Ligand binder design. Structure first.
Ligand SMILES: [Cl-]
Ligand SMILES: [Cl-]
Ligand SMILES: [Cl-]
Ligand SMILES: [Cl-]
Ligand SMILES: [Cl-]
Length: 129
C-alpha cells in the first residue's frame, strides 16, 4: 500500500506516535517519507548486508527476523515480512521500542540526515488530524 501523506499522519496519530518520546507527528511522517516514500512494501538492502522493511524501514540487524542477516537479533519478535502489511500496527509497535532504546529517532539514519532540525511540521500541514 502506498499511503497518502495525511492518511499516514492520521494512522500514526491513532497509534499513539504523536509526541511519543517527545517526537511530534511531523517527525514520524518525515521519517516515513524518506525511508519508504510512504510505501508499506518497501525493502532495501543496507551497507552491512542487513535489510530494512516497510513504511519505517525497520532493520533486520536488531529488530526483526528475515533469516538472512548473520549475527542479528529479532528484538521486536516479528518476521520482517510482517512489516510490509497495509496495516501499520506491527511497524508502529516496533518503532516505539526502537525510539525508546536510548538514541531516540537517530536510529533512523534518514531521519537524522533529512528530518532532524528541519521544519517537520510541514509534513502534517493540510491534514485533518
Ligand atoms: Cl508527499
Ligand atoms: Cl509536527
Ligand atoms: Cl537472520
Ligand atoms: Cl520469523
Ligand atoms: Cl530523544
Amino acid at each position: 500500500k502506498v499511503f497518502g501523506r495525511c492518511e499516514l499522519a492520521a494512522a500514526m496519530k491513532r497509534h499513539g506516535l504523536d509526541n511519543y518520546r517527545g517526537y511530534s507527528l511531523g517527525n514520524w511522517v518525515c521519517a516515513a517519507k524518506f525511508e519508504s516514500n510512504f510505501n508499506t512494501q518497501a525493502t532495501n538492502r543496507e551497507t552491512d548486508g542487513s535489510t530494512s522493511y516497510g513504511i519505517l524501514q525497520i532493520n533486520s540487524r536488531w529488530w526483526c527476523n528475515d533469516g538472512r542477516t548473520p549475527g542479528s537479533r529479532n528484538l521486536c519478535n516479528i518476521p520482517c515480512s510482517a512489516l510490509l502489511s497495509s496495516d501499520i500496527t506491527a511497524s508502529v509497535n516496533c518503532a516505539k521500542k526502537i525510539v525508546s532504546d536510548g538514541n531516540g529517532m537517530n536510529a533512523w539514519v534518514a531521519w537524522r540526515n533529512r528530518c532532524k532540525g528541519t521544519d517537520v511540521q510541514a509534513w502534517i500541514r493540510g491534514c485533518r488530524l
